[PDB]
Amino acid sequence: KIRTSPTFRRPKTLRLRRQPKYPRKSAPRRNKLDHYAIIKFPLTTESAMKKIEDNNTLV
RNA sequence: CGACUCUUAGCGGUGGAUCACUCGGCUCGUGCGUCGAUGAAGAACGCAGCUAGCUGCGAGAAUUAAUGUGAAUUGCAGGUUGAUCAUCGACACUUCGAACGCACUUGCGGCCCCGGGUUCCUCCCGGGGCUACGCCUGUCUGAGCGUCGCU
Ligand SMILES: [Mg+2]
Ligand SMILES: [Mg+2]
Ligand SMILES: [Mg+2]
Ligand SMILES: [Mg+2]
Ligand SMILES: [Mg+2]
């Protein structure tokens, strides 16, 4: 071939993709942060009740 | 006289000594002599109907399963096919931390696979699995006017 540049760079190298012979974890972790765990409980204070009454919103 | 002061005694205060108790120490001896990338020691934050501390525990959060035991736990409520305790082999085990995508603000990514938008056509949202350094054996892809062999 021809060398038109004075510098030497590391040649392009083919690299494989991970192909494990066994998953490291037996099962995926259950999603502990779900919709039931998102909401804990509503608020019942004076400001919350007024906010529900007028602003059409929940707390 | 009366006040004040002093002494002694009774009683009452003040104080917490002495004595008697002791689920604590100290010392000696005996058997065993076991941590961690399958993530340790340590730290942080959370978890109880009423819970601050101590203790216990980890979003399955003062505990799940299993076994033994056999009618309680208790401060107040409430509700034998096994209550409560103990054992502990199944399961689970938040964030940091050797701490591991990059940094330490919990900020910013990349790749692959799923569920929402789509009805993959790409974005966007959610979920899951990987993405640290060094090193060993093997595999693949390479480099060298290094040593050569055929053209
Ligand atoms: Mg006196
Ligand atoms: Mg608490
Ligand atoms: Mg049980
Ligand atoms: Mg039982
Ligand atoms: Mg900064």
Contact A30, A37 (CB under 8 A): no
Q: What's the CA A17/C1' B85 distance, rounded, in angstroms?
A: 55
CB closer than 7 A to strand B: which residues? Answer: A 11, 13-14, 16, 18, 23-25, 27-33, 37
DSSP of A7-38: ---PPP--------SS-SSSSPPP--S-HHHH
Tell me the CA–centroid distance for residue A30 and ligand 4, in Å.
29
CA A58/CA A48 separation, integer angstroms: 7
Closest alpha carbon to A58 in A34, A33, A41, A35: A41
Closest alpha carbon to A50 in A58, A39, A40: A58
CA A58/CA A23 separation, integer angstroms: 44
Closest alpha carbon to A41 in A16, A24, A58: A58
CA A10/CA A22 separation, integer angstroms: 33
**What do you get for the CA distance between the two ends of chain A, in Å?**
72
Closest alpha carbon to A59 in A47, A41, A36, A43: A43
> Nearest nucleotide, C1' to the C-alpha of A40?
B59
The number of residues making up chain A comes to 59
